[PDB]
């Protein structure tokens with residue numbers, strides 16, 4: 273389908289056995305979620321946004337259900353103010369911008 | 372047009388006779404541009420994202436052109452690391468997300 277942008281484009285995602293709301297964010301390179309538990313190995317990384325840098329945990333090959341797709345993605349976990357779906361996952365579900 | 376998200380979605384914008392590169396960002400409520408001079412009244416605004424908050428200047432009713440689509444829109448100016456086109460302008464040019 274098609275999603276307009278008068279409202280913040282939140283979608284429900286299923287990850288780590290949890291249901292979460294996350295913002296579809298074409299301005300994000302990466303998918304970044306608030307503090308949560310995920311299984312498996314991780315490595316720490318620094319990322320930066322509008323306000324400066326934060327430390328995140330990088331989990332690879334994490335299954336995510338989003339917009340009717342069964343995806344597998346890298347997920348960063350850390351102190352973001354909002355769960356964000358970045359282009360790494362938007363590309364994987366065939367999402368595009370159109371005007 | 373239609374824009375894939377395998378690369379960052381930068382487009383050329385025209386504002387006040389200036390050409391700039393800006394990110395089409397569905398995660399941003401409002402357009403925010405790197406430090407520049409604009410005419411007319413402004414008021415301070417706080418915005419927030421990854422890494423914290425920044426103070427910006429809010430200018431209303433500024434003409435901006437994107438890929439031949441003209442809008443009159445609110446433009447925030449301040450210490451963003453990148454020029455960002457937000458939902459307030461994306462809606463005015465008819466931009467949607469498509470799966």
Ligand SMILES: CC(C)CN(C[C@@H](O)[C@H](Cc1ccccc1)NC(=O)O[C@H]1CO[C@H]2OCC[C@H]21)S(=O)(=O)c1ccc(N)cc1
Nearest residue numbers: 299300301302320321322396398399400401418419420421
């Ligand atoms: C965190 C979002 C809810 C809001 N942001 C827009 C977002 O697209 C920024 C836009 C952005 C882009 C580059 C640099 C700074 C901000 N991207 C971002 O923080 O992504 C980070 C995770 O992926 C990495 O890729 C880029 C930075 C990392 S924001 O830049 O803070 C912002 C907030 C409010 C307004 N009006 C305008 C912009």
